[PDB]
Symmetry: C2
Subunit: 294 residues, 2 copies
């Protein structure tokens, strides 16, 4: 027969009857159809193995994955890949909305570094999206007292009173009058996507000299960071300038298209992490080309 | 022989020896070459007839123009047309720079409406472009005291001292650390180009019911505004939807390509103004078509 699956989006949770033998693709397609989401290339169904993220594979039976067999089998529907320009690439409202909620949560939880003035500008669009137009007759002093709008780190950097933080957000909010909810969420993405950590998946690696570094995998390419600086990578390899990315035991090899550049090798200890790195490299390389033409 | 011509750019003033019989084209080309400017189609050499703007005509002798002959004969080198997409179309540093200075002055002079928070963010990029990275050891409280950074309109909307505005501007300025000066000017333009009044030439007109209205001519088309609202036009005629634009006496006729829409007629009495409207319509329409390979 079927087994119950619970799907958690950034919006809500829902359940479906999964045919005991369906593959990831079947379940994934059903979720996307239900949401009315056709820009499917950015999304996946996430589960966790130990303390590492993993994504359902399209060509593999759902119950063959390393997931609890206990009903309901639960997956989180999330963006696995990010566009380079949200305004250009995200055509549907549902798609824009789900990116907005996912990225906002990353900002509020300090997964993406966001400086204070940017955080206030972002909060003002989140307020527009939720409340609609500012109206001083309805939105009186203190109207935002129970809303989570800013990263905690930002409060630590400024020594302002509750009233002054509210005023700073309101000031920007007042200038968005006339903007529809969906527009506000897109404006939010437009600002967020310029943040240096936006859309980057970081992994601890070691180069051949044994130096601890971070690998960043993103929509633009593969990047090497010093561990103390997640903002600006020291080396970048654009997706269209990489010939091959292979893995064997704890070692990855980045093969440049330009033969004048030597192959770049690094090590990564966890098998489950390496599997994820490969998933993200293949997918990002793919979308990079798709978004460019072809 | 020659006569001295004074050319005023947004950067500085310079003088040239203009041959007694040179045409507009000769003097314009000399100015562009001197600036190292090849993206010349956006620019012209401006003078004033009574209270109205006028542009040097390329095929007419400089001295046959209705310009004061008191040496130095003076022209202002200015953008007459604006790109639809500044980041894409303004490729040379000089072109970007001249656009940046001219639009900034429009903002500071209140020719383009700009709300307060936007004004501060804009100012912060103007500061990055002028001073380079924020350095608190050099840029002490008060370092911006003699700079004109915000529209007077904005300053007068609040009870804030110059030091308080400096604080707001500095907070943003601090977040631009690492941005090159030319890049900061482009960031300024990207924000400015989205302001509702950006790039619009306005003219007082009367429709056939005798109603006072404003004609807006810009890179995208022709627009009809209520005089009390220069931000949002009530009617827009995109350039690719207009057959032709002409006038006879004080009457202009806009002829839609969609025969289902009646021609739009309006009056404008000042001949000097009507000549300017025509030039701006022809040039904008022509550039719009050319951007679209037609």
């Amino acid at each position: 027969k079927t087994f119950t699956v619970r799907i958690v989006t950034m919006d809500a949770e829902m359940e479906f009857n999964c045919e005991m033998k369906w593959k990831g693709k079947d379940l994934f397609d059903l979720v996307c159809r239900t949401l009315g989401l056709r820009e499917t290339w950015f999304f996946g169904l996430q589960y966790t193995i130990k303390d590492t993220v993993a994504w359902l594979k399209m060509d593999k039976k759902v119950l063959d994955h390393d997931v609890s067999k206990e009903e309901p089998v639960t997956f989180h529907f999330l963006a696995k890949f990010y566009p380079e320009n949200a305004e250009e690439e995200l055509v549907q409202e549902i798609t824009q909305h789900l990116f907005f909620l996912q990225v906002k949560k990353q900002i509020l939880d300090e997964k993406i570094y966001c400086p204070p003035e940017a955080s206030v500008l972002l909060a003002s669009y989140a307020v527009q999206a939720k409340y609609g137009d500012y109206d001083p007759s309805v939105h009186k002093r203190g109207f935002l007292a129970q809303e989570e709008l800013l990263p905690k780190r930002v409060i630590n950097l400024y020594q302002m009173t509750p009233e002054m933080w509210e005023e700073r957000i309101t000031a920007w909010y007042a200038e968005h009058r006339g903007r529809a909810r969906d527009e506000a969420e897109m404006e939010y993405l437009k600002i967020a996507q310029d943040l240096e950590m936006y859309g980057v998946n970081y992994f601890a690696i070691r180069n051949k000299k044994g130096t601890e570094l971070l690998l960043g995998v993103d929509a633009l390419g593969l990047h090497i960071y010093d561990p103390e600086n997640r903002l600006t990578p020291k080396i970048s390899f654009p997706w269209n300038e990489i010939r091959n990315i292979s893995y064997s035991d704890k070692e990855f090899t980045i093969k440049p298209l330009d033969k004048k550049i030597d192959v770049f090798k690094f090590n990564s200890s966890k098998l489950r992490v390496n599997k994820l790195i490969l998933q993200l490299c293949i997918g990002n390389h793919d979308l990079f080309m798709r978004r460019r033409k072809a």
